[PDB]
Ligand binder design. Sequence first.
Ligand code: ZN
Ligand code: ZN
Ligand code: ZN
Ligand code: ZN
Ligand code: ZN
Lengths: 258, 191, 380, 52, 115, 322
Amino acid sequence: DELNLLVIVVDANPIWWGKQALKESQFTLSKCIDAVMVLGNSHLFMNRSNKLAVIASHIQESRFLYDGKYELLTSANEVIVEEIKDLMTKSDIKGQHTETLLAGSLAKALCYIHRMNKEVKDNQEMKSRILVIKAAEDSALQYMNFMNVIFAAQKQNILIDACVLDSDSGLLQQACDITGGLYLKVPQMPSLLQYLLWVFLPDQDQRSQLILPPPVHVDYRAACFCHRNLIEIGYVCSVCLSIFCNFSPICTTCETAF
Amino acid sequence: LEEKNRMLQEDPVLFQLYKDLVVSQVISAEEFWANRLATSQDIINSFQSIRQEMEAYTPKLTQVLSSSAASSTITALSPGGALMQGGTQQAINQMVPNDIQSELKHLYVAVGELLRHFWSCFPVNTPFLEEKVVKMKSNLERFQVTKLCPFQEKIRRQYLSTNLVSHIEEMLQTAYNKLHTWQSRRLMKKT
Amino acid sequence: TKRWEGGYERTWEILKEDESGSLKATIEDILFKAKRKRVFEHHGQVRLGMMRHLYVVVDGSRTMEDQDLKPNRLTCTLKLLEYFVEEYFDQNPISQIGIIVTKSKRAEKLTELSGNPRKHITSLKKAVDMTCHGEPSLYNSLSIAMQTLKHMPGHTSREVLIIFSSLTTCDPSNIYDLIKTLKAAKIRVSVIGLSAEVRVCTVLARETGGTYHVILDESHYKELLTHHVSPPPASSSSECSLIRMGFPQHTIASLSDQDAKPSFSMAHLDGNTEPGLTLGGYFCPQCRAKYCELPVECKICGLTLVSAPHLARSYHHLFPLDAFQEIPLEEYNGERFCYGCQGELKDQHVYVCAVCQNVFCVDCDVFVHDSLHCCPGCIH
Amino acid sequence: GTSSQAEAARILAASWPQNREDEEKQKLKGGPKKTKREKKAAASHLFPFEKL
Amino acid sequence: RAVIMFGVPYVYTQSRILKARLEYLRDQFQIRENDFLTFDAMRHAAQCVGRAIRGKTDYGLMVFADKRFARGDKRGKLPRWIQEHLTDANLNLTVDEGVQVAKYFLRQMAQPFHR
Amino acid sequence: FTSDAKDKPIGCSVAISTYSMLGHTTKRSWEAERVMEWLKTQEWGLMILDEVHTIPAKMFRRVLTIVQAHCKLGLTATLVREDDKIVDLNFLIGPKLYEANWMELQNNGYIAKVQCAEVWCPMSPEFYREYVAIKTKKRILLYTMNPNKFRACQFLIKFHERRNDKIIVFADNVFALKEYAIRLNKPYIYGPTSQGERMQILQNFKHNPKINTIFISKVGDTSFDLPEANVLIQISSHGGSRRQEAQRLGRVLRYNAFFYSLVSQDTQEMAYSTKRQRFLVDQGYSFKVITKLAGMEEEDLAFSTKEEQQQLLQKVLAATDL
Ligand SMILES: [Zn+2]
Ligand SMILES: [Zn+2]
Ligand SMILES: [Zn+2]
Ligand SMILES: [Zn+2]
Ligand SMILES: [Zn+2]
């Protein structure tokens, strides 16, 4: 009667993966996709009722990615491979946008989890969690939307786990701390699959049994309204609670509201 | 005199603070009670390169992981590893014994009081407060030389692994930097 | 005449059949009628707020020994006060609570006016075992509250809450002059009595603009406190109200790094108990002081330390999500897959956003309007 | 007396519906509960004096 | 808010003024002396106790501190607008139960009402 | 018109009276005779009957024939009755118009959701021998005064007083109720006491924190003005009176509340409780069975030792009503 749903958000930003490929390093996007597929197969093998979802984030949008081995896994892997090929090959850079649409992917994941929860029979509880692997730099323009997504996830009691590869993201740290998830930065990229299977594979009930690395130093720097930049000291309106970097005689937000 | 003495008698912690500030010539008794009262087309080239690379993509099984990588990751994730550092001031409750701890608390209280006075003086909007901030900085320097340097010597002699001095220096260094920046800005306004 | 003396209602007349089996389809509409039972608003009331400096006055006379509320008035009052403090700090990010206790014709400031929730609860728990003696003095408590709140900035809403158990008060001077002074000082005073209505409390509440209520039982007491939880409405733009506050990052210390400096918390240094010597905590952005609780105003530099998510949690009220246009499935010429949940659109009605023109099913529309508060299509 | 108290307690508290229920409990699960949902339902369906 | 009657107020029988009126009523109007005395006492009590209710919004408490008021011949002399509110439950109750009744009445009357 | 004040019923719009007064077969009072003569000389509009379930009686049936009215409206809470005389009520007054659904009524929150309990107690060895020894109607006191049931009742009283809940203890066979109530030194209503004492006891039961438990002996088996209570404990009621148990349950609702029924195992009281709860299970209530009381031995209760238990036999057999 225990159902676990795992949604894996893959940072498929073409710029960062192209730079990684040009670096000629031992880790590429192909290995990341293979590790994600292996993690999904392991999650499906953990229990029959386990449900898997994979969402790939791109500059354009979010794509729902979902002989001798399991039949369902063979079908599942082929669909994911076809989707990732279709997304990347047909991805054409049209504009100067470079930040990853991480907030939209999380919103789609929340909508999918909400859809799946209703279809579950009332006798069983669907424990759901979201795992995010971060490759590109964080986007400060989507701060409010990201916070709204975090609050929505916390309201429905959905764990959010972040697997940072290259650069730490404050938004992911806040999401992990607020929702009670696990935040981890990968020291060695080629060993990504072992980290995923050792840390993020167990469910919340099993995480109590096991011993896990302590949470990293989570920051809580706020985003200014007129700059959308993280700040430590700033001016905050007492009515609308808006945050400003510099003092102003009149609040812009309160002036907007009539 | 009699009234002042009874106040210190009621609070021995304040009396020890009074001795550490007035007797040691750090501050005068007059000032003591005064406060008390992106890139070029290379990005497009990389995008095209990754698109071409992922056009011909095939899943792999052996290439995903190796025995050495898994062993190294487990060693890192084993207790006492890099990510699983289990010490984290293992016996800090028993280390740096309570005799040092009481002195550390007294130093923390003194630094907090002095910095509270300094930041209450800040910002300096009147010429009167200009001298008060200089006197506060002089008192801070005198207290540091009188207490922290012997404290640093005691720590070095006992070889404590905790960097108790470092945090106190950070606050004092930040205060000094803020004062220097404000003085520079004041000089800028006069240019 | 009367409404029920006319014709008897036949509610079963709604269902109809035309093909000897169409009834199922009708109940399907009923299922579609089952959903959308909310107004798409979790609160639906005040869409803004204003900072409050609330003072809670607690009677400490012999009347608190009465056993109207088990076990006595004082214990239930303090329990509900702890609940009120928790809820009030939950629903007000930058508000402050002070506590005054009136006893033996005198007023004692039990806790200073601050925003720390843990300190007030501990003070109340300590005060649970106090000794009830003498008679209350509303004049002294009101004078202390006015003296403290006189210097507060005008944009802040100054509120005083009095929990008056005893029916008699001793006034060293005329109280109506104090009431006029409070009215001139723009202080809102609300009283929640326990025994019966008192003329002076009613006059004070009426003149100062507050509300006076009398407890019927413990449930009514909790309801009155919950009503007092909600912040008062504020004007669209009143003054130049801005406050300098910092945002401390929760930096923990690990022995793996060389920057792990143990430090005693400034708040914990003021307690009688041994201060916590923890690895790390919240560092002040101005003077690098260490604190363990938020939101706590810094004792050294006077800066206020506030957690950004607490402030951001109320931003959806500033930008409410516009209702999506309900469109029947037949009249929509496009993709039949939901943009949010990727599910097939089979319901009779499909909701389309007015900005991104994406299609959302009933479940996704309800989820967006209730919890997400942001359109996923508009995010991209 | 003290012995009479114990004898009366033994006679009363375990007369009919304990000589088998206690034996079944001795031969029962023993380990932890099945799920947390079962414990919540049991607490909801138990009387206030049976939860103390 | 509360009007207390400490005993039935009986006019003094001295001065040989009340007794002359009693005799005149007895031999002329056939009025019982005891009945007239009870009538006068209850009339004064009701007159001095009914002034606590002036206006629809006004409310008040009325207590009689004498067991003699519990007798029917004296309750019947109260005005009709007070009889129906004087339930038979509280006619001889002790001090503590009277205090409890007063507390309950005041607590339930402190709530707002409508027009 | 109940022969108490006689507030001039002649020339009135609304008249309120009671049964057993309109159907007297004996000599009547002079004033009452004239009142009845006046009343039997005009039409009545919407003659309202309360507790209609006990209409089919020897003298209550003729009441409808002794007055003339156009509409006869009957109101009750427990329409179940023995002697299958409810069928007669179909033509005595009219058809059953409305039957409220109690489950949906309590789902809306306007009726307290009472958690029914049927907790039984084993028969003590000093009592079961006498219970099986005698059969000529003398066994009622034996299972009525079961020491184990007494201990269970005392424990429930103490628990619900510690949690501050109003308690009403129904107990027929007032001979047993005497020693049942004086043992705990608590107020009780014998029934043939007086009118003022019962009224004042019920009036001070509600608004008094010191006393929050009362005992009723078959007096509360009708529609009275009993105040709101959360705990009801019934011991040794009538045999199969579904009406009585339903009425007793109705005195609680107005889990906000819960009521307990104590019975003695291996006795006729078990069968009586089983056969009297069928009306409530038809209404939708479920009677959970409680076999063990948590913390029974935690505190001291009466009849702790066997000495007083065996002493109880003499005083319970001391009836000898022969
Ligand atoms: Zn700004
Ligand atoms: Zn504003
Ligand atoms: Zn600071
Ligand atoms: Zn959908
Ligand atoms: Zn949209």
